[PDB]
Amino acid sequence: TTVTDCTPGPNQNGVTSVQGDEYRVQTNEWNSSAQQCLTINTATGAWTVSTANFSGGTGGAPATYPSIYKGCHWGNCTTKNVGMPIQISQIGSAVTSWSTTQVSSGAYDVAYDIWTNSTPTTTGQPNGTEIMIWLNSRGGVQPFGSQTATGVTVAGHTWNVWQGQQTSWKIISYVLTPGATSISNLDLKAIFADAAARGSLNTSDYLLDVEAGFEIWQGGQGLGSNSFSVSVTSGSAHHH
Ligand SMILES: [Cl-]
Ligand SMILES: [Cl-]
Ligand code: NA
Ligand code: NA
Ligand code: NA
Ligand code: NA
Ligand code: NA
Ligand SMILES: [Zn+2]
Ligand SMILES: [Zn+2]
Ligand SMILES: [Zn+2]
Ligand SMILES: [Zn+2]
């Protein structure tokens, strides 16, 4: 039940189904051909960056974003107990937990990447909002855009907020302050409400996916995911 995927970027994505295809793990080396290997437990969904040593500057785009997700990434979709796509305004609840393993070397973030879109499906780049949630970072890396709030309270935690404009979507990043290696029962509905209040999210958009992993600029070996869960609910109770 343990698989190792080194699919080289920048144009190939290696995608591994885990936990009955409730989640998928992707190499997603979207900006590099440097060696990157993931080791993935398909029963538990745990994974590790077992081989990586990225080099380059700490500015601009990262080399890679190896990640686990529920929902659709560029048309590659999970198939069990999904709850997405769903219009943000129609979400009943949305909760996630993530436990990570970090290394005190290199330059990276430890981040959720959450996509929204005007229509419920897309084959490519979402056109709504990218919501990032940085549990931690090191090595001097910073979020896209500009810091627009400092030490704000959202969904029971304290954050700095960064907002930016990409070519066809808006980005908002919640930077946990101080950083940590895990988060439990994070209320994404509360995050979405805040992002809408701050002008970064149209709540008529569809939520496409919830991803978590590491944007890596330098290093990367030994970063990992111990456990990951996403629950997005809708509809009413009904048994047959
Ligand atoms: Cl910007
Ligand atoms: Cl689950
Ligand atoms: Na499940
Ligand atoms: Na660079
Ligand atoms: Na980024
Ligand atoms: Na991004
Ligand atoms: Na809530
Ligand atoms: Zn990708
Ligand atoms: Zn906290
Ligand atoms: Zn905690
Ligand atoms: Zn905490």
Active site residue 130: yes
- Ligand 11: centre distance to CA 135 (Å): 9
Give the per-residue SS3 of 136-200. EEECCCCCCCEEEEEEEEECCEEEEEEEEECCCCEEEEEEECCCCCEEEEEEHHHHHHHHHHCCC
Closest ligand to the CA of 59: 4
The closest of 128, 10, 119, 114 to 62, measured between CA atoms, is: 10
Domain ranges of the chain: 2-233
Largest CA distance in the chain: 57
Q: Which of 22, 29, 130, 211 is catalytic?
A: 130
Mode of pairing for the β-strands spanning 170-176 and 129-138: parallel
User: CB within 8 A of 147, min separation 6: which ones?
Assistant: 160, 161, 162
- Spatial contact of 182 and 101, defined as CB atoms under 8 Å apart: no
At residue 123, the 3 state secondary structure works out as coil
- Spatial contact of 78 and 204, defined as CB atoms under 8 Å apart: no
- Spatial contact of 27 and 13, defined as CB atoms under 8 Å apart: yes
- Ligand 5: centre distance to CA 49 (Å): 18
First to last CA, the chain: 34
What amino acid occupies position 239?
H
- Give the dihedral sign, CA 52/141/72/41: positive
- Spatial contact of 129 and 213, defined as CB atoms under 8 Å apart: no
Closest ligand to the CA of 95: 7
Binding residues for Zn(2+): 73, 130, 157, 187
Taking the C-alpha atoms of residue 8 and residue 43, their distance in angstroms, rounded to an integer, is 24
CATH architecture label of 2-233: Sandwich (2.60)
Taking the C-alpha atoms of residue 139 and residue 223, their distance in angstroms, rounded to an integer, is 14
- Ligand 6: centre distance to CA 238 (Å): 38
Structure-solving method:
X-ray
Active site residue 211: no
Taking the C-alpha atoms of residue 72 and residue 187, their distance in angstroms, rounded to an integer, is 20
After which residues is the chain discontinuous, taking C to N > 2.5 Å? none
Taking the C-alpha atoms of residue 79 and residue 180, their distance in angstroms, rounded to an integer, is 31
- Ligand 2: centre distance to CA 38 (Å): 21
Taking the C-alpha atoms of residue 144 and residue 5, their distance in angstroms, rounded to an integer, is 29
Closest ligand to the CA of 98: 10
- Spatial contact of 187 and 154, defined as CB atoms under 8 Å apart: no
